[PDB]
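Schema walkthrough. Field components (list of strings):
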Amino acid sequence: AQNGKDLLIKLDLQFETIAGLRATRISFNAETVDVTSLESQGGWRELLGGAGVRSASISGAGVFKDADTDERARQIFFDGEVPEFQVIIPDFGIVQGPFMITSIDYAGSHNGEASYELAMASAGALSFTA
Amino acid sequence: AQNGKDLLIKLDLQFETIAGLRATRISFNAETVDVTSLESQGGWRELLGGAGVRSASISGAGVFKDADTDERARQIFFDGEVPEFQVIIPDFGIVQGPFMITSIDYAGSHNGEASYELAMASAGALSFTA
Amino acid sequence: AQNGKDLLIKLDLQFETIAGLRATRISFNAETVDVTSLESQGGWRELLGGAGVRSASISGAGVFKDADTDERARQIFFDGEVPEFQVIIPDFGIVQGPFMITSIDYAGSHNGEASYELAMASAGALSFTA
Amino acid sequence: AQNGKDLLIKLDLQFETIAGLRATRISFNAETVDVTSLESQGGWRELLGGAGVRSASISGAGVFKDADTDERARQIFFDGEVPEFQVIIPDFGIVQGPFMITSIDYAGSHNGEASYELAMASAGALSFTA
Amino acid sequence: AQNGKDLLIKLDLQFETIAGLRATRISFNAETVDVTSLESQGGWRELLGGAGVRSASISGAGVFKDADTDERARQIFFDGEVPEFQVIIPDFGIVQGPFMITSIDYAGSHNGEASYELAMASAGALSFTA
Amino acid sequence: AQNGKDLLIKLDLQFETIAGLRATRISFNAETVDVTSLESQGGWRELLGGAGVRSASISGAGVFKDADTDERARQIFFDGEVPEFQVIIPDFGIVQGPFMITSIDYAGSHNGEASYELAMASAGALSFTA
Amino acid sequence: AFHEVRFPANLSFGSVGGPERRTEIVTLSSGHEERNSPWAHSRRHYDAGVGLRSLDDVERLIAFFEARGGQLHGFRWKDWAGIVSFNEPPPQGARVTAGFEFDVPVRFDTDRIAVSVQSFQAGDLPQVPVVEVR
Amino acid sequence: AFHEVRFPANLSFGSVGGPERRTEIVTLSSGHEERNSPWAHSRRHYDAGVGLRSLDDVERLIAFFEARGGQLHGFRWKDWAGIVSFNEPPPQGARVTAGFEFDVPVRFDTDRIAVSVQSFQAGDLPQVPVVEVR
Amino acid sequence: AFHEVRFPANLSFGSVGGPERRTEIVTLSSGHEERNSPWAHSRRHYDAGVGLRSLDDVERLIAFFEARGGQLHGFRWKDWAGIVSFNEPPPQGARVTAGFEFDVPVRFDTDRIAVSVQSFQAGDLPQVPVVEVR
Amino acid sequence: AFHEVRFPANLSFGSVGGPERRTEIVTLSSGHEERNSPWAHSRRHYDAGVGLRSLDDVERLIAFFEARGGQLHGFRWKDWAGIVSFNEPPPQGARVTAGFEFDVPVRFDTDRIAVSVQSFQAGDLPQVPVVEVR
Amino acid sequence: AFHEVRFPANLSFGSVGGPERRTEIVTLSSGHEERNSPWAHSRRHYDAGVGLRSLDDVERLIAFFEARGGQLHGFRWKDWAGIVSFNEPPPQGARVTAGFEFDVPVRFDTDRIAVSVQSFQAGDLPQVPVVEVR
Amino acid sequence: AFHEVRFPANLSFGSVGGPERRTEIVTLSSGHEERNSPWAHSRRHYDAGVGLRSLDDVERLIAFFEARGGQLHGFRWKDWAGIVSFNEPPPQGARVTAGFEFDVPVRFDTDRIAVSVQSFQAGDLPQVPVVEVR
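Field assembly_structure (string):
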């Protein structure tokens, strides 16, 4: 078993995690390049595999606590960059990829928190430190 | 931690917050200008970053209490303008942007309130007072 | 604070509210005419404002109690008209607009009420009595 | 107030209601023929009204109890007809329209009922008996 | 009233019901061939009726208990056939139609069952035994 | 009855199941090649059957526990392959198909687990060991 | 030329048609223009009729083209849009009606028609243009 | 010219075709104009047939074009739309039927056909236009 | 040429039109080239008007083409876009207005019009291109 | 002309093709017709082949056009649709097979081919028409 | 030819344009080719400008075509893409700039323009091509 | 003819191109026909290149067309698809490589290019067809 407190996204400025990090989710994708020739041993769909583009997307939720890493993401959004982002998996290790800052949003209610979602997507080739 | 009572949207007439402000949510966006060349170190999607247009959208919910700032939004809607709007983030600061008044709606039930949603979207370049 | 019992939609025949008026919701709209020139001080989306068309839509729910104002809406639907409709906001005032009777529906169950939704949309220029 | 037990859909064979009639819902429609000329006193959307086509749709739910009126609907579906259907509104009166039998479905579980939905739509000019 | 335990789908091999049959639902359809001429006594939509194609779809849920009728459906899927399927309605009777085996799926969790959905659709002319 | 603990997906490296396997679901498909000629004994839709392509998709959920089989899936994703995957059905048997690693995602919250979904889809002809 | 019937009742939404003129024109290249009209009238030129009913209506429609049609006969045409004048200008329309009450005798502008089957009983044909020969 | 068979049974929704009239025409630039036709019949001119079945039906369909077809043979055609008259006008159709019961012998309006494979067993061909040569 | 009325008030979003210049041109294959225009004005050349109202508006619109129209008459045109000058360059527009206040007398660029029926009361016509003949 | 290989195995759903004829035709304008056939055979005329595999399959496919192709060689073609006869009419097909078992020697109907890259390893080309020269 | 202004500031995403050459070519049919260039320069040939603002911007844009335009004047053009050289090859661009700082004097490639109304205040025109006459 | 550089690295998915053969052909109306080609090679004929990067890449790309381009120079081309032979038939490719390692010197098949701006930094151009002149 692995603690959900262990997997951490973190910005550059040298890497530090953001403050409100209530729920985060790295999500990989591939578009499944269908190569269905007429011949196929039972009429099954055949796929190519390595031809497909592959992606990554980070969706971080949290409560707005002011930190320099939280101010950094605003500066990354206004001065639109694609810097290095890094996401630990507990016992796998970090990812250390270039991402962008696709859509952030700050929210607040009459009774609750200052909360924020932070949605990111892949911008380059990723890595894995094991 | 930051109180959700602190983040406040406010109209011009000099800035004052609206009366029923039950739930409000500034939401930023960027359309992620995909620049996927054939070369890419693992077939990863590459993105440009700063080429993307960037936006902001405000969705304010609340209960209809008559105020001059609440009458102002009706006047902003009928006499269709794009005046300055300002949204505090608790410990970040204000935003102070030109928005429009995209869609408002007043609602009432046989037993409940006179309630209203107020949806806004970005109309110009935004700011940040820190 | 304003009572939700106060905001009332009402038909002409001279104006009277309909019988079952369980939940009603005037909803305004504008389609946000995007005017995004290549120049923009941070790549922000620019909007025009007053060029956008603007609308209104009324969605009234309620329980079927037979009234002359309830029979009127059936007559407005079969003899398809666009008469004047009027919606009070508690402390703002009335709207007094021409609407149509876009979609109504009567519903009943084996145990519950004869209930009805009544959906309307704007048909002309609206007003505001303050 | 009107009892939901009062509003009844009924088939011809002379009119009799179907057996399982757990929830029924006549639903009228009009497609809102938009006539938006360039001139309009505030840029409001103008509508024509009577040019729009108008419809009716009946969605009856219930538990499968075998009746001759329930067998009739199967015969109406296989021998595809558009016979007269009639729906009472409690204190309004009947509708007495030609409908078709658009989609029916019988369902059953390992523990529950033999249940059925019965979806109908308008097929001609309707009426109203007051 | 009719028991939901009575309505049964069943395969050929001679007809036997499948093992896990938690929830089943035959669903008929017709696409409603709109014949809306310019003339119509109130501008009502006119429909043709018998010109529409008509269909049937069976969605059977259940828990995977190994039976020869459950192995049969796998053989019907891999060796893609359209054999006769038969669905009882409690007091109506059977349907006895040719269907195909459009999409099946086996599912299991870390704590629950081996469960399966079985979705079928019409493949020919149906019947009714009364 | 069959235990949901019994149905197991498993990778090659020789086959071993992955660690967090909270909920898994093999899902087969066929696209239903509609062959609707003008003649049909009641206007019913006719289908061909065996002409349709057929597929399989595996959606495995679980909590991130580090295992060599869990590291294998990362290596299968970065070095994009289509290796053999194998899914037991309790009393049917294994499937033993070539799949790809279409989309995986690691997620974690401020209080919960390191969790992951693992979505796969068919890449070749499948099998069945009975 | 006949006086046989109006038409099948059904006409789909989109039955287009409006008056014509030859009015040949020179467009004097260095200034304004001058242009002549030899008509004093207008061909109403209705197009884009569509029959949409059951197949029972089709066999009385395909031989509508054939039996009283051929090519060269009237079949007075119904307009959803004895002398009628148009007084909304201070000029005048003053256009005659040989047939009574907007009935505009025509002929089909087709060497062939093309009826389609859309479902077990659906009969469709996309266009039957006319020009209202006198 | 043959009397061989109707056709494969299958025809997709969209099998269009209607009578084609020579309708030699003068189009006087003044206005109204006269016209005449030399047929006293009408080529029925059916188009847009589609075969859709298994590949077992295809080899009896591709050689339908070839074996009894060639180009110049009958293969009596079935209409989903011995003398038949049309009495819905006071005029008459009175159009003959050389073959029995709507069987209208034709020929395909194609130098080649084009059969496609859409899946392991799906056989499709988009059009076979005919004209019912006497 | 008339002074009759502006137009029906309704014009749909898309009523396009802008000045048209003779711009006789030589296009030397070497490179740069000279050009001259003989107008000293610009035909405003408005297009794509659409009438959209009830069928009560249609009969005053179809005979707008016919009665005061014909082909060769004025019907002063309203622009949603006595001498007007344009001073935003140090050059000048200095373009005359024979009619008062943007009323630009025109004529339709059509031998025929084509009004459609889209529902019990909907009247549409897709285009009426003009060119503002002097 | 070669006897080299069938083809790459892959063919996409949509590989269309069917026999041709010249069968020139006069259409006697006042009655039926008369038409001649000089073939006694048919060009099978297969079109719309698509190669879709990895880029490892592409270099053995682009030089399939080049190496044994050039322009003027056989490359026997596989049909997904020694003398074969067609007996479903009382007429006969009786069409010869110079190659064994539906192998129909052809040539590509292209001056050039056009292979596309769809992803890091996807190779596509939209069409390779053939006509089966003897 | 003027030196009047750049342009209205607004330009939509899609303002395309790149240099031209005549470079006529013989393509020697049995081997390689030989080809001549008479330019030593390039027409920059910008196209597809779009004005999109309020109707207040439109009247200063329609007379931009008219007042300082006519047909035959400069209106120096702003490029979103005194001698500039291009040194990224060991060859050179060495292309002159008669105007300062990428200002490329042009002329519109249109006999007419076409401004549209998209909403109560939206003004659009789809294209204004230019070629940069010297 | 140059040896200057390959190209900008970026090429979008869809960069199509394959060998083009003269294939002079006679098409005898009888039936089978003969043919011959005078190349003994094949122009590779690559098309549909797309540059997509920032505007910093654009000014080194627009003058790529201009500076070392003009029209009539090499700019060795990189293929994502010293003598190479093709041995998958018993025939041979045996096609020469004047440049090293798939570098295929070409020229663009365009009198002009057309670069577009799609956002503050996006530079696009839809096509640069080449033909690999020797």
